[PDB]
Amino acid sequence: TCPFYKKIPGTGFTVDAFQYGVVEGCTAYFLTHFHSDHYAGLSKHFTFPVYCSEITGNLLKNKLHVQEQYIHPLPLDTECIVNGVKVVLLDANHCPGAVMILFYLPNGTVILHTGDFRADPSMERSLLADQKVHMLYLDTTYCSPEYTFPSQQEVIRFAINTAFEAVTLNPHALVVCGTYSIGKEKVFLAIADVLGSKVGMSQEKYKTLQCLNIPEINSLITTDMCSSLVHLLPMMQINFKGLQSHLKKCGGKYNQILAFRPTGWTHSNKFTRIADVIPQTKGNISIYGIPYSEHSSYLEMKRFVQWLKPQKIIPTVNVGTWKSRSTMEKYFREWKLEAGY
Template identity: 50%
Template structure:
């Protein structure tokens, strides 16, 4: 992949790549395409609400969809923008007038699919049935979100009440996983980690009676099935979910995760091969062999030190989603002994983690520290220049965009080959810091677990991609 093919050079206002290469998307989740989005406070229109600020911070980059070849020339030239589906309704916010906004995405295509489904209800996406009620197409929960032999689903809230399901698991608080949860939720208990539980309650106002907090590494018996939440090494509160059925079979659902060696020492994972592994396959392609997070963190810290040495009046900016990338700005803060400025909305989220090491480093005054955290969508030359104009004590901006989508095969693990983009007083580094497993990490994890069956949960909407992944699985199990 050469520099011209980076899908991460331009991100939309929610942190998604604005130009998506084919097969880079997750077919299992839907987003809306919205033009001219404007968010206003639901109360008096003065300033931005907590919900609005949370929305602007974006979501996890794993929920990407393919470009629609049927888009008009005008749309193609302006680029496709993916945003968090139904978040306006979820938060009760108003948006700028846009009668065309809100087209759902099914099978990687947009509004035209809804009309096609109404005309032909036999159309369906792989793994997902389409039921009809009158003239409205309704999607049924896909098989890879249901845990076979149990009354449970994982990250399937957007499908509403699911027949036969008496327990809904939430792996972590990213919108492509919690989408569909609203304050009116009443379909059954929501099982998740304590951090995720606090976020579900405070951010979505779901009634506490439906929120069931499960501690990590603690075995619970739920409807006769033993369940254990395991650290997923993804974002705060993210968990892999280990199910031990009555007949002795064990299933592991990874949610979104980044595989690492320490997982192999966990007694549950080392004691029995899982019958079924529901696997996060975001980067299940041999071209994704990005470096370890530790190496990327070290590189980022060294660049930040060098930047401040050359120009002491440098403002360091780290782009982040609403949840995730905390280790990047925490590493810079610790190495340089400086505080971290975040706005009130993000500060509220970070403090909900109960992560003292991070909380004690947070600042509410952007003028007193040179380290600021901004939504990843802010990392453009124009927006950073405007932001810098508000802090006259700084002479330049050194910004980091930490996401696996910045990875280049040409650079690989040679981080020193990364070339920043500069314009005027603004310099932006794209660093391949991912919170999903690389191809080699997936391979090692699967070879360690030796599951009887693997069900991919990402990039499943394309037959060629599914076949390619299955071939990878077969090769891994043979070697």
């Protein structure tokens, strides 16, 4: 049954709560973004109202076959009334279509739910500016100081330069990029752009990208694998066996693979700068793990929360152990006391 941190008290609303059957008292179900841990439960048989972004709506309709009558897309940065309550959707800087939700409760309390987010200083000049917030439901994925990683811009610079160098030295090299969900599309799009290629993929992945409102997408992607020198593969295929196997299918067209496995944080970020990253290599195959994050670093999270100054914080990630909960509460207290409060 539905946990407390997914219910919005004083309303009939839940957030990312589709795996518990019919939730008692819920008149509208919000979905922050199209990642499987968050949408788990939605299908053609769902018959309650779903509120979400336009992009999330396109994915519900086309990938999950949710009926059009139950999909309620809302524009961003716009005051909307849903079942007698004012709400706003804001860009979460996570994956395409991902939002944060501001709820203005009938009693005067204001709640921000971040969904999944990568905090950025630009959020300090959204509709959040000068908005008192009484409760923050916070994506705490990386709420500990050891979690460091580079900017997305720096990671993309490394990937572009690495790919362009390799293919310029060897015009018969193939570039492969791993994927298992939406998000991190800039990795493969930026590489293909520098190489003057479309990105080749399966019919199923092509379908998914066609839902994302990316400008000029028809010019960037294709299902014709033979015409492309940047290929997308499921993430589980990005290993020496899987890549060797893939190289056979291309019909003696290529003699080297350079592959990228986008990850979240990993322990090697503690020691190695993004510039100094080296691949795993076996013969003519090389694999780069690159830390492209769509969640806040510890420092980004701390900056956002110290700016917002919420009265109370409810974590939504790492909530399962006493140690995790204790650690997170200690950091929130440090941040408050530090800020002069």
